[PDB]
């Protein structure tokens, strides 16, 4: 009569590494590293992302004509740019503190596009029909949907001074532009004053802009330049524009709402009818595992990114079916 | 292993023991068979469950983390942001891989120890009423029916009850 003591064994082919030995076949084990995604852009906690289509942030914010127009009000969980964004700034020039603006938009969860300065109504004694071929649409020369190219009317550019009081109860993103002709002849033909200036003030913002005329290499067949500026007008505060030339005036502005967990990602994937808690530029992750090796860029509640190819924890025994 | 049982003086595992990690095999007149030890298996499961769960718990939820952009005159800040991201990534990859290796080693050792401890528990219960025939087995110096076997398995083996007969067979 005999009794023996022994241990479990099974057919498993799971292998784990240890310090003293690599590649040990074990009976049981747990994988801690997520490596699978669904290859789709999804809703994040039930909220769809903001897709900019053919535009980047600049093209969308300035109102590039080539980009399909979005609904007046939007709410999102994250912003998606496409890698090949052909439509951005269409009239050559610098967009000041653009990166800072993107970083601001990274915590915005909603916008309302509203007419801050109505077209035919706000700039009397000035022309508002200025267009350009650098910003073409359907072949014809056009211009930014959110801005207005003010020029001389009937041989004169009278000093304008207009203002907006923010009664939206939220921050209002106001954008404008400053035009820089390549010569003084064009400066006179457009704004009738060689010593022009633009002034923009709020309670906490205070800037003055002066035309700087010089011949420049052609960009998008333009020797002139256009510098783009922006400011966030606090609730209740007032913004004042004052100019006698060169002002690319605001026409539409954005009432903004703040949120958490958002961000801007560059992605190729397509939006699908699906929901997730974790979104990467390559696809959505549905996992409760502590690590992932899919992508460093994550939106939502995601596992920690690591470079590892394998993170497998043994729980069972050294497997010896022999 | 560290305690010398698994892949040691007990060469291999039992595909035939399907209801636990550690267990017994017996052979007597009534027949033979496998029966796992639940007290030890359930202790090991509790332990390793708590180990896995802590490895998961120590890693917090990774909330939103996306890239930033910098203009052509902010190369230093761009490289510093990159330096930060790469540093943190190195450190976490290192930490994860190392923790998994260490804990794997300790887990195999833990199992080895459980098997050895079970063996020793049985040995100390049986004393000289049986002999160690190697490979983790005991040969009784007396008849051990199903009831006797079960008394051994649930830790209530009655040594004096079989001491005489065993002494006689051992001679």
């Amino acid at each position: 009569d005999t009794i023996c003591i022994g241990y479990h064994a099974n057919n498993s082919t799971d292998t784990v590494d240890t310090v003293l030995e690599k590649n040990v076949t074990v009976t049981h084990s747990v994988n801690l590293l997520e490596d699978s995604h669904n290859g789709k852009l999804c809703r994040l906690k039930g909220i769809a992302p903001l897709q900019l289509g053919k535009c980047n942030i600049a093209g969308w914010l300035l109102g590039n004509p080539e980009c399909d127009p979005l609904l007046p009000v939007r709410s999102w969980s994250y912003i998606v740019e496409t890698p090949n964004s052909e439509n951005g700034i269409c009239y050559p020039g610098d967009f000041i503190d653009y990166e800072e603006l993107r970083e601001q938009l990274s915590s915005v969860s909603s916008f309302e596009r509203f007419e801050i300065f109505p077209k035919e109504s706000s700039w009397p004694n000035h022309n508002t029909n200025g267009v350009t071929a650098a910003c073409s649409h359907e072949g014809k020369s056009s211009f930014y949907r959110n801005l207005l190219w003010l020029t001389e009317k009937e041989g004169s550019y009278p000093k304008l001074k207009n203002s907006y009081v923010n009664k939206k109860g939220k921050e209002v993103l106001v954008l404008w532009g400053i035009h820089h002709p390549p010569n003084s002849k064009e400066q006179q033909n457009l704004y009738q004053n060689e010593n022009a200036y633009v002034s923009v003030v709020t309670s906490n913002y205070n800037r003055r802009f002066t035309p700087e005329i010089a011949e420049r290499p052609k960009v998008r067949d333009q020797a002139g330049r256009m510098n783009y500026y922006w400011t966030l007008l606090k609730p209740g505060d007032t913004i004042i524009f004052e100019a006698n030339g060169n002002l690319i005036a605001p026409m539409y502005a954005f009432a903004l709402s703040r949120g958490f967990g958002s961000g801007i990602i560059t992605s190729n994937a397509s939006m699908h009818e699906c929901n997730t808690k974790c979104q990467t530029p390559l696809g959505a992750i549905n996992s409760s595992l502590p690590y992932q090796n899919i992508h460093p860029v994550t939106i939502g509640e995601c596992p920690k990114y690591v470079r590892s190819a394998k993170l497998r924890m043994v729980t069972g025994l050294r497997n010896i079916p022999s | 292993g560290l305690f010398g049982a698994i892949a040691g003086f007990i060469e291999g595992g039992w595909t035939g023991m399907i209801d636990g990690w550690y267990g017994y095999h017996h052979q007597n007149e009534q027949g033979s068979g496998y029966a796992a030890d639940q007290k030890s298996t359930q202790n090991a499961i509790n332990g390793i469950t708590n180990k896995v769960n802590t490895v998961i718990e120590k890693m917090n939820i990774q909330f939103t983390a996306v890239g930033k952009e910098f203009n052509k005159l902010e190369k230093r800040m761009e490289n510093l942001n990159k330096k930060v991201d790469d540093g943190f990534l190195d450190i976490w990859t290192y930490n994860a891989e190392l923790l998994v290796l260490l804990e794997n080693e300790r887990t195999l050792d833990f199992h080895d120890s459980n098997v050895k401890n079970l063996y020793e528990k049985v040995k100390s219960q049986l004393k000289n009423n049986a002999k160690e025939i190697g490979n983790g087995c005991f040969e009784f110096y007396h008849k051990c029916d199903n009831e006797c076997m079960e008394s051994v398995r649930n830790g209530t083996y009655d040594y004096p009850k079989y001491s005489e007969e065993s002494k006689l067979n051992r001679e």
Binding site: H28, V30, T315, G316 | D19, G20, W21, A36, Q38, T41, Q42, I45, N46, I48, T49, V52, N53, I56
Partner: peptide
């Protein structure tokens, strides 16, 4: 997590 490796375990 729960390790349901055997069917008589308690959790």
């Amino acid at each position: 997590r729960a390790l349901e490796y055997f069917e008589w375990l308690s959790x």
